[model samples]
Target chain A: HMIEPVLENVQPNSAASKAGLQAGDRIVKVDGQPLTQWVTFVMLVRDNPGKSLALEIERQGSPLSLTLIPESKPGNGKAIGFVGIEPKVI
Target chain B: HMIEPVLENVQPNSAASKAGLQAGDRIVKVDGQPLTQWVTFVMLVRDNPGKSLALEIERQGSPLSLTLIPESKPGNGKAIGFVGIEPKVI
Candidate 1:
């Protein structure tokens, strides 16, 4: 794996919480697309503001599925998506 | 373990280097005192500027010992010990 797309932190009452996401959750796939690199997963989310997405995750080795709608936020003079999540890195 | 006193990174030419320490080395004891919490280990180092210390470490499960003399640095209007290492957390 280029980078494990694991969530280090999830803001309270954010989109991720609304979609049942939590800290320490490892994102395996998004919208049926397999994900490995963190940057790729970030780009996928950042580019699709307010768009509904299917998320495949592994929490403590248990597989789960959820739906998420990235909140729209202004960034660099354009609207970008935010999940209110932080990445875990070594 | 309250918190694993593991070295996530070590700075070159720093006090840790002079003591033969490296990144990924786990500090098991300092000055004959067993260390388990990162805070305790930090206090042991931070409070003793330029004092020689005996360090016990675990490198990939192998036990080793070394001597360290922390570099004296100014902090908050007082001299403090600096080892130039970072902690790894999960």
Candidate 2:
């Protein structure tokens, strides 16, 4: 199955902002792996906490690379990478 | 409307645990504000960030006061408070 990337929502003051990630940025890959599905991206981010993530995206027919650090959830301490951007379903 | 406080789920390693808050504990007040509704509790917690919160709860016919420090959300920096407990709807 071909997975699609969607720009949902952007979280305020997140790593995505520091990396200059905006909504509608089509995520192409994470650490060289094609991010074809949202679950794949989520799992990849969950597995890597407090680590730098390499995101390759396509915006306005141009390619962009953003590096972000994932932070752990406060209460549960779950890894939800700190990307200050939310993706909407396209 | 008489707001009822429902015990959701307890978050692990949260202030709720250190203060001995368990599920089904009826929240009576937060910092003297009667917690009759979830919104009131949420707003109270949001308004008072990084401050010690006084929670009055009735558990098993016993009343208790728990002093908890509210922590901000990791990314948005929103105050969600550090209560290592989740409440279930009753």
Candidate 3:
């Protein structure tokens, strides 16, 4: 089953911003693997925090590539990165 | 009735990006008037395109000022500017 990725809010001064990642950018792939489910995308990034991951994205009819370094949030036990924006299912 | 402003996507290389405006920033006012409805915000911006509008914002618990010079778009009959990010109701 294919699940859509839920693009959440991106934090300021984070990797996502520095890498030119924007909100409304859809994630098509992660580390050479296609993102067919949201869980898979989250797991892939969480499990490999601090590592560089290649993000294939579709942005407003254009294709773009963004390299993101996942970071961990303190006390939340959640490893993540900010995209400097937010999104929802269209 | 108070209607929330739907934060839409901010376009790249636009006024919003250059002014450090992010996607999730809630617009509280325009030109000293509090934005209680999206339509009011849109009408305000549309009617006064190419002018400076004071955008009162709440960004991650910090207050900031972004002086925006709204521009017009050709062929769309739309006079607007890009924010370089997208937003939704929280």
Candidate 4:
């Protein structure tokens, strides 16, 4: 089984939190693209700094949509997107 | 076209230099696996720290073989392999 794109550690007043995201929100899709793995979602977020993303989420078995804009952060000689959200890992 | 796995800037006395690697040496295979891109070779080197690697290289127009051991280096949050060699970029 792959690690699901579940959101966790939604920092207060951060991009994810401001976009109505919360802990336990499983990201089903982003911009109509299926997000089956957490790392793929992370890569998407990292590549699109400051770009608006239409997120399809499943919260408690209910479908919802949120608009998320990842903030740009400096990383390793380039700017990468950061949404102040982490994936739940076990 | 893919970036060929060509060696460049081999540091003096480094593992790559000690193993007889030199600039313009194109890595054709590693452990029988064809290496078409530089990043894949970099990943292989990063994942296997302190391990012996059989490198099949194409120097000029002739084939050659070299045994290389990547030295362990601290990276991000873990130990990774480093052979003090970089790929030629244009």
Q: How do the predictions measure up, each by TM-score?
A: 0.49, 0.44, 0.41, 0.50
Q: Per-residue lDDT for B1-90 in model 4, tens only?
A: 334577666777667878888888998989999988766787788687789898899998899989988888766557877788744321
Candidate 4 regions exceeding 4 Å error are A1-90
Whole-model lDDT per candidate:
0.76, 0.61, 0.59, 0.76
| lDDT (10s digit) by residue, model 3, range A1-90 | 233564565557665666666666678888778876554565565465568889888888688788887665432444443233334321
Q: For residue B71, give model 3's deviation from the true position in Å.
A: 1.5
- For residues B9-89, write the lDDT of model 3, one tens digit per residue: 666666566666666677777777787665465555545546777888777767666676655543245444333344332
- What TM-score describes the B chain of model 4? 0.91
Q: How many residue pairs clash in each candidate?
A: 0, 25, 5, 0
DockQ, per model, reads: 0.03, 0.02, 0.07, 0.03
| Candidates, ranked, lDDT | 4, 1, 2, 3
Q: What is the TM-score of candidate 4? A: 0.50
Task: Give the per-residue lDDT digits (tens) of candidate 1, residues A41-84.
Answer: 77777788899889999999999999989898766557778787
In order of the candidates, what TM-score does chain B achieve?
0.89, 0.73, 0.69, 0.91
- Which pairs in model 3 have colliding backbones? A10-A84, B9-B86, B10-B84, B10-B85, B11-B84
**iRMS value of model 3?**
11.7
Interface RMSD of each: 13.7, 16.9, 11.7, 12.3
- Candidate 4 positional error at B44, Å: 0.7
How far in Å is the alpha carbon of B74 misplaced in model 3? Answer: 3.3
Global lDDT of model 3: 0.59
Please report how far candidate 3 places residue A31 from its true position, in Å. 49
